[PDB]
Amino acid sequence: FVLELEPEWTVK
Amino acid sequence: GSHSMRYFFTSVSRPGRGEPRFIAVGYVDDTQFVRFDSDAASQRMEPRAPWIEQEGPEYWDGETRKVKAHSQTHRVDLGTLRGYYNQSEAGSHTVQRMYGCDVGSDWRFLRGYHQYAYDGKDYIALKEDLRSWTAADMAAQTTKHKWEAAHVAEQLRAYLEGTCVEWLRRYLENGKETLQRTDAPKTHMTHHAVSDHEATLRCWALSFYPAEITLTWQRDGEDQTQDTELVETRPAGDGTFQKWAAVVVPSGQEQRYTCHVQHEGLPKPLTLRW
Amino acid sequence: IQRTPKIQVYSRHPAENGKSNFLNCYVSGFHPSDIEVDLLKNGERIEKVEHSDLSFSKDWSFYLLYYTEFTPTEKDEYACRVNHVTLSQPKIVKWDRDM
């Protein structure tokens, strides 16, 4: 079951 | 013994044309159970173990949605990171992400992790407490500040301590037949005479699961690393693993040497002798 | 970074001449992920070779298993040929029954 990666969690 | 669920994500930029190559793989312990490959035709998270196939369309839709979102985050990051390091728009670069959770023999949370790398080097990683970050350079330090302001660690911790463990437990039960089975190493010794005065003894461990194993040589009951070779543990391709260790010995003195095999599937460690 | 691939060429099961088996080439410890791996029978490239999905170790280095069904014999020679940015020329590792 994969993480719900929120859109703001980019590196920049 | 302990169990783990781990996901591995690799994105490789293709700046001549198109989106990055994106490959995602999910493991329970040393068993791959899902995959996504951007070059494959389905554009779906795909099953790679029989025990995950029973999951319904809601599961597969969800996993596909999330893994695609991962790919787009990596796509954005590849673009911005190229800019920070002042790298050319022609060259290929890599983002890698790994995260997951370990549970103990009681199937309860032991530890969590979330690590990120650019071009094969550490970038940012969640610390063991799941409340703080290790940033390798100043780009990653700026990322730390951003992610601390956005409370990323708290939300990752919720997943790693909760969601990750719950689904790991589901998979362990559903895949009991294979995931909870230990395959003890099938062991034997071979002998090769390189000359009249020198011989190599090779101690084999085959068809074992999980991959964790220790193979050691002794001479007259004490450990020997001198004149030994130990290969990396390798996949057999049927879900099991292989390893060997060799020792070079004087011809005629083979009986002095013993190979010792430690593995979860062995109640007591095994001793082999020529 | 650049890391050169480690290579192991081996059979899935103990080898017996004239009996079907699987030939493995395990490539590991490399970066970047772009790599060319071929399995050879008497120097000629074997077709329809499959491989695992790209994954990596704690140190970020990649690993892949390439594999195919094969029947060893006394006469036939099997090998794995690997090309990578770190290598000046293709690295060929011959299969041996004792490794």
Numbering used by the authors:
A (entry chain C): 1 to 12
B (entry chain A): 1 to 274
C (entry chain B): 1 to 99
Please share text taken word for word from the publication where this structure appeared.
CD8 T-cells mediate immunity to Toxoplasma gondii infection through recognition of peptide antigens presented by the MHC class I (MHC I) molecules of infected cells. Structural characterizations suggest that these long ligands interact with the MHC I molecule much like canonical peptides: The MHC I alpha chain forms a 10 x 25 angstrom groove in which peptide ligands are anchored by their second (P2) and C-terminal (PΩ) residues. Surprisingly, T. gondii ligands were significantly longer than existing structural models can accommodate, and a series of peptide analogs demonstrated that these longer peptides are not anchored to MHC I via their C-termini. Crystallographic studies reveal an unreported structural re-arrangement of residues in the MHC I binding groove that accommodate C-terminal peptide extensions, and this structural flexibility is discussed in the context of infection by intracellular pathogens.
To determine how C-terminal extensions protrude from the F’ pocket of MHC I, we bound the extended ligand FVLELEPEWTVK (UFP16-27) and its binding core FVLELEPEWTV (UFP16-26) to HLA-A*02:01, crystallized these two complexes, and solved their structures at a resolution of 1.5 Å and 1.87Å, respectively. The 11 amino acid core of extended ligand FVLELEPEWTVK interacts with HLA-A*02:01 in an almost identical manner to the shorter peptide, however, both the main chain and side chain of C-terminal Lys12 protrudes out the end of the binding pocket. However, for HLA-A*02:01 in complex with FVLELEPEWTVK, the side chain of Tyr84 swung up and out by almost 90 degrees, opening the binding groove so that a peptide might protrude from the groove at its C-termini. Lastly, there was a subtle but noticeable increase in the main chain distance between the α 1 and α2-helices at the F’ pocket. In order to resolve this enigma, an HLA-A*02:01 crystal was solved with FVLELEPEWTVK and with a version of this ligand minus the C-terminal K. This led to the unprecedented observation that the C-terminal lysine at P12 displaced the Tyr84 residue at the end of the HLA-A*02:01 binding groove. As such, Tyr84 emerged as a “swinging gate” whereby a longer T. gondii peptide extended straight out the end of the HLA molecule at its C-terminus when Tyr84 assumed an alternate up and out position – the open gate. For FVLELEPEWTVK, the affinity of all 'mutant' peptides was significantly worse (t-test, p<0.05) than either the binding core or the native full-length peptide. The melting temperature (Tm) for the two extended ligands exceeded 62°C (YLSPIASPLLDGKSLR, Tm = 66° C, FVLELEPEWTVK Tm = 63°C), temperatures that are consistent with ligands of conventional length.
